Ligand binder design. Structure first.
Ligand SMILES: C/N=C(\NC)NCCC[C@H](N)C(=O)O
Length: 213
């Protein structure tokens, strides 16, 4: 299930961009691709906000695993997302709803398939910014996490508020792949809110407040 890492590199700086729980969150690396991302959102948003452009990128078919353009309901801007699943709506037949994963951020929302657009191919150039992680060295106190544990983890990381943190990789878990192929590895990291005083260890705060062990 889970392996230790005797050869961690130097720690790096990241923003926590989305959280599901301490066992499953997404970071973006601090650096020049963030501003490239910013530029990309603005561009996609100016572009897909015109009808003419939506109609030249109307989806006649949509598939699970497909990368598309999608509005995020909380700000009305356009993002690159991957269709994770499609589910029916029994009260409206004109509307299947797609579970989409916002690839540069890591959150997932249900969007009506009607409002997705084909993603113009040049918009794939920039690397997908969201890296899945989990927090090393903690487990929930008897994703099996208590909701307020998750909540507090969102406060400590200041999820989605562009607060830079220091990340050290300590463990990992292997992810399965096509047979014979190399396995992927999700990193188990520790996060620190570094300052002149010293460091806030986010997981150590969770353990002390009784949310984790
Ligand atoms: C966290 N996931 C995002 N997109 C998929 N975020 C995009 C930016 C959200 C915007 N700042 C806002 O206030 O809504």
């Amino acid at each position: 299930n889970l392996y230790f890492q005797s050869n961690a590199g130097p720690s790096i700086e990241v923003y926590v961009s989305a959280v599901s729980s301490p066992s499953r969150f997404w970071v973006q690396f601090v650096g020049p691709q963030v501003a490239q991302l910013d530029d990309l959102v603005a561009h996609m948003t100016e572009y897909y906000s015109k009808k003419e452009n939506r109609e030249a990128h109307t989806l006649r078919h949509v598939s699970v695993g497909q990368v598309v353009a999608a509005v995020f309901r909380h700000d009305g801007r356009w993002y690159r997302a991957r269709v994770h699943d499609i589910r029916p709506n029994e009260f409206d037949s004109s509307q299947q709803v797609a579970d989409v994963f916002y690839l540069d951020y890591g959150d997932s929302e249900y969007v009506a398939t009607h409002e997705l657009c084909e993603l113009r191919a040049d918009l794939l150039r920039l690397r997908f910014q969201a890296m899945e992680c989990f927090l090393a060295g903690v487990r929930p106190a008897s994703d099996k996490w208590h909701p307020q544990a998750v909540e507090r983890f969102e406060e400590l990381t200041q999820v989605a508020r562009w607060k830079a943190l220091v990340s050290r990789t300590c463990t990992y878990k292997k992810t399965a792949t096509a047979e014979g192929e190399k396995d992927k590895e999700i990193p188990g990291i520790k996060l620190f809110d570094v300052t002149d005083e010293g460091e806030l260890d986010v997981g150590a705060v969770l353990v002390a407040e009784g949310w984790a062990v």
